[PDB]
Amino acid sequence: CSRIWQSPRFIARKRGFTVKMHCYMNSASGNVSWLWKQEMDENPQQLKLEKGRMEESQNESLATLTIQGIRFEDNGIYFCQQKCNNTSEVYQGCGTELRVMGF
Amino acid sequence: CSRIWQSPRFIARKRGFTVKMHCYMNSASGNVSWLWKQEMDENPQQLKLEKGRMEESQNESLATLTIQGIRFEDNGIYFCQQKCNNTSEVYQGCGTELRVMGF
């Protein structure tokens, strides 16, 4: 199968704004999901797309994840994950660090 | 083969100091090579070593790239690759990022 690329590595924004996180592939057994991680030891875990604040999007090449109303409680690193058709193995993106802040 | 794990993710250090970067793998068809990216737009372009001040070492399970007396020209992201035994696939780390300081 294909390989996935995550952008950007890091993001800092102001409380209440909006964020976009990308990932690229070719839908080779496409259909992408997003994992979240707040602690460093614990390992990534399914992100709950909170009604009216988060939305998993995806066409055939781009799989973007968009969050609005950014809360501090959103801090952490997010990874897009794809399950391969052939290899039936899971490739992970390199994730994006998220930091909310200020006025 | 084995999922490659690069560490740390991002580093900040005043110029001149030396810096080590890590890459954990399995070395099966291993023998790691290091790539470089001066910006995010650019593409992971190969790394050229310079006079005793940039040395890559490694063993059974730990490849580590070392840079002495760092400069702003060093700023960027470094990745490590390892061909795979079985697969003949090309795994790659999530690269460690570098930013040199001014004081």
UniProtKB/Swiss-Prot annotation, chains A, B:
PTM entry text: Phosphorylated on tyrosine upon B-cell activation by SRC-type Tyr-kinases such as BLK, LYN and SYK.
In this entry, the parts of the chain located on the Extracellular side of the membrane are 1-103
Q: Where in the cell is it found?
A: Cell membrane
Q: What are the coiled-coil residue ranges? A: none
Q: Which cysteines are joined by disulfide bonds?
A: C1-C84, C23-C80
Glycosylated residue positions:
N31, N59, N85, N86
Q: How does it assemble?
A: Heterodimer of alpha and beta chains; disulfide-linked. Part of the B-cell antigen receptor complex where the alpha/beta chain heterodimer is non-covalently associated with an antigen-specific membrane-bound surface immunoglobulin of two heavy chains and two light chains. Interacts with LYN.
UniProt comment concerning the protein's domains: The transmembrane helices of CD79A and CD79B chains and two IgM heavy chains assembly in a four-helix bundle structure that appears to be conserved among different BCR isotypes.
**Protein name stated in the entry:** B-cell antigen receptor complex-associated protein beta chain
Q: Which organism is it from?
A: Homo sapiens
Q: Which gene encodes it?
A: CD79B
Q: Covered range within the whole protein?
A: 43 to 145 of 229
